[PDB]
């Protein structure tokens, strides 16, 4: 009555150029819980921005965003409010409770 | 009465150029729960933005967004409010409870 | 009375160029629950934006979004409100409860 | 009385260029539940935007969205309100409860 | 009645050029919980920004953001407020409680 | 028994682009007289002359006028001759002669 | 028994681009007289002359005028001749002669 | 029995780009007289002359005027001749002669 | 029985770029007279002359005027001849002669 | 029975870039007279002359004027001849002669 | 049995100005044969070409031949082909074979 | 049985100005044969070419031949081909074979 | 049985100005043969070329030949090909074979 | 049985100015043969070329030949090819074979 | 049975000014043969070239030949090829073979 886990990665020509959260032979349990969280952001991989020209002869205002992945003008809230009573979050990877 | 898990990744010519959350031989349990969360963002992969010209001769306002993946002007809320009583979230990978 | 899981990835010429959430030999349980969440965003893969010109001679306002995948002007809410009593969310990968 | 699962991915010339949520030999349980969620967004794959010109000689307002996949001006809500009593969501991958 | 875990990484020609959170033979438990957190930021990998020219002849205001991945003008909050009573978050990797 | 005159010009977005002799809140008396005068001339506002080609292979004379508003070859006289006796010109804005 | 005059010009966004003899809150008397005068001339505002080509292969004479507002070849006289006796020109803004 | 005059110019965003004889809150009397005068001239505001080419292969004479506002070849006289007796020109702004 | 005049110029963002004879809060009397005068001249404001090419292969005469505002070949006289007797020019701003 | 005049110029952001005869809070009397005068000249403000090429291969005469505001070949006279008797020019700003 | 031949040229005033193949007392035999020959050419005697003018203003091609005797654009062949057997050409001046 | 030949040229005033192949007392035999020959050429005698003018203003090609005797653009062949058997050409001046 | 030949040239006033191949008392045999020959050329005698002017203003090509006798652009071949068997050419002046 | 030949040239006033191949009392045999020969050339006698002017203002190519006798651009071949068997050319002046 | 030949040249006033190959009393045999030869050249006698002017203002190429007799641009071959068997050329002046 045991627990056994492993991960092999025998590799000859391995290339992971521009990646994120890659698993190449693993064994996880990975329990996770999030009550109030918030992700804001822009990611780019193998992007190219070649040649940009902006002029303004006689103006009162001019804004500009050009990059490969842009995010502008956001307003977010993220909350969990337990104002009465009782709140439980288990988030268990795996349970093993066996008798004999 | 045991638990066994593994993952192999024998590989000869492997290429993962621009990727995200890739699994190439794994064994997971992966329990997860989210009460109030919020994702805002723009991602791009192998994008190209070549040649951009914006002018403004005599104006009062001019805005511009050009990039390969844009997000602008959002307003989001995300919440869980337990104001009375009682709230449970299990989110279990896998259970094994066997007798004999 | 055991549990057995594994994943193989013998590979000769593997190419995963621009991908997301790819599985190439896995074994999961994957319990998950979401009460109030919110996804907003724009993604692009192998996009190309070549040649963009915007001018404004004599105006009072001019906005512009050009990129390969755009999202603008959203207003979303996402909530779960338990104001009385009682709320349960199991979200179980798999159960194994066998006697003998 | 056991549980057995696996996934093979013997591959010679594999190409996954621009994809999302691809499985090439897997074995899942995958329980999932969502009470109140919300997806807003635009995705593009192998898109091309070549040649764009917008001018405005003498105007009071001019807006423009051009990209390969656009989304603009949305207003969504998504909620689950349990204000009385009682709410259950099982969302189970698979159950195995056998006697002998 | 023991616990056994390991990870191998026999490798001949390994290249991990520009990556993040990569695992090449591991064995984890990985319990984690987050009550109120907040991620804001822009990441880029193998990006190129070649050739940028912005001029302003006679104006009152002109802003500009050009880089490969930009994020501007955000306003986020992230909170968990337990103002009544009771709040628990387990977030367990894996449990093994077996008798004999 | 007084005289009162004024002129207001409260203005939010005022634009007078190409104009002449414009009054936007005034109070005048404006007496004027002209015995012998003479106006000759050409005026243009927001005119455009784009693309003009004139050739002359083998000629003895060739004249040309092209501009947006042309005036050519005039011969005018303007006179007032008082050779006897008596000539009066009042040209009064406004008179106020009241007794009591 | 007094005289009162004034002019206000409260202004928020005022623009007078290419104008002439503009009054935006005034109070005038403006007596004026002209016996013999003469105006000759060409005025232009916001004009554009783009692209002009004139050639002359083998000629004896070729004249050309192209500009936005042209005036050519005039011959004017303007005179007032009082050769006998008596000539009066009042040109009064406004009179106020009141008794009591 | 007095005289009162004033002019205000409270201004927030004032722009007078290319103008002439503009009044923005004034109070004038402005008596003026002209016996023999003469104005000749060409004025231009916000003009543009872009691209001009004139050639002459084998000719005896070729004249050319191109500018935005041209005036050429005028012959004017302006005179007032009082050769007998008597000539008066008042040109008064405003009179105030009140008794009591 | 007095005389009172003033002029205010409270100003926040004032811009007078290329102007002439502008009054922004004044109080004048301004008597003026002109017997024989003469104005000849060309004025330009915010003008542009870009690109001018004139050639002459084998000719006997070639004249050219190109500038934004040109004046050429004028012949004017301006005179007032009082050869008999009597000539008066008042040109008074404003008179105030009140008894009591 | 007095005379009172003043001029204020409270100013926060004042800009007078290229101007002439500008008054920003004044109080004048300004009597003026001109018998025989003469103005000849060319003025320019914010002008630009970019790129000028004139050639002459084999000619006998070639003249050229290019600048932003040109004046060429004028012949003017301006005179006042009092050869008999009597000539008066008052040109008074303002008179105040009140009894009591 | 002999052969006798002679030629006399007693001459007093002989003139041969411009000639060709002239005989003035001769005695010939003159055997001749020609199998394949070819004469091309132009001859002139006592010719005169006085005054020739050719011009070409603007053309793509112009050819000209003027001389007293011209020959242009010929294409001739001249041949004798004996490809079988037998070919004789005697061409004898004169034979004298007499017996006795 | 002999052969006798002679030629006399007693001459008093002999003139041979411009000639070719002239005989003035001769005695010939003159056997000759030509199989494949070719004469091309132009001859002139006592020719005169006085006054020639050719111009070309603006052309792409212009050829010219003027002389007293011209020959241009010929293409001739001249051949004798004996490819079988047998070919004889005698070309004898004169034969004398007499017996007795 | 002999052979006798002679030539006399008693001459008093002999003139041979410009000639070619002239015989003035001769006695010839003159056997000659030509298999493949070729004459190309131009000859002139007592020629005159007085006054020649050729100009080219602006062209791409201009050729010219003027002389008294011109030859241009020829292409000739001249051949005798005996490729089988047998070819004889006698070309005898004169034969004398007499018996007795 | 002999051979006798001679040539006399008694001469009083002999003039041979510009000549070629002239015989004035001769006695020849003159056997000659030519298999493959080629004459190219220009000859002139008593020629005159007086006054030649060629100009080229602005061209790409201009050729010119003017002389009294010109030859240009020829291409000739001259050959005799005996590739089989047998070829004879006698070319005899004169034969004398007489018996007795 | 002999051979006798001679040549006399009794001469009183002999003039041979500019000549070539002149015979004035001769006695020849003159056997000659030419297999492959080639003459190229220009000859002139008593020629005159007076006054030559060539100019080139602005060109890319200009060639010129002027002399009394010119030859330019030739390409000739001259050959005799005996590649089989047999070739004879006699070319005999005169034969004398007589018996008795």
Curated annotation (Swiss-Prot), chains A, B, C, D, E, F, G, H, I, J, K, L, M, N, O:
Effect of residue 35 to K: No effect on oligomerization
Domain of life: Eukaryota
Tissue/organ expression: Highly expressed in presynaptic terminals in the central nervous system. Expressed principally in brain.
Keyword Secreted: yes
Oligomeric and partner information: Soluble monomer. Homotetramer. A dynamic intracellular population of tetramers and monomers coexists normally and the tetramer plays an essential role in maintaining homeostasis. Interacts with UCHL1. Interacts with phospholipase D and histones. Interacts (via N-terminus) with synphilin-1/SNCAIP; this interaction promotes formation of SNCA inclusions in the cytoplasm. Interacts with CALM1. Interacts with STXBP1; this interaction controls SNCA self-replicating aggregation. Interacts with SNARE components VAMP2 and SNAP25; these interactions allows SNARE complex assembly and integrity.
Medical condition linked: Genetic alterations of SNCA resulting in aberrant polymerization into fibrils, are associated with several neurodegenerative diseases (synucleinopathies). SNCA fibrillar aggregates represent the major non A-beta component of Alzheimer disease amyloid plaque, and a major component of Lewy body inclusions. They are also found within Lewy body (LB)-like intraneuronal inclusions, glial inclusions and axonal spheroids in neurodegeneration with brain iron accumulation type 1. Parkinson disease 1, autosomal dominant: A complex neurodegenerative disorder characterized by bradykinesia, resting tremor, muscular rigidity and postural instability. Additional features are characteristic postural abnormalities, dysautonomia, dystonic cramps, and dementia. The pathology of Parkinson disease involves the loss of dopaminergic neurons in the substantia nigra and the presence of Lewy bodies (intraneuronal accumulations of aggregated proteins), in surviving neurons in various areas of the brain.
Protein name: Alpha-synuclein
Organism in which the protein naturally occurs: Homo sapiens
Whole-protein residues included: 1 to 100 of 140
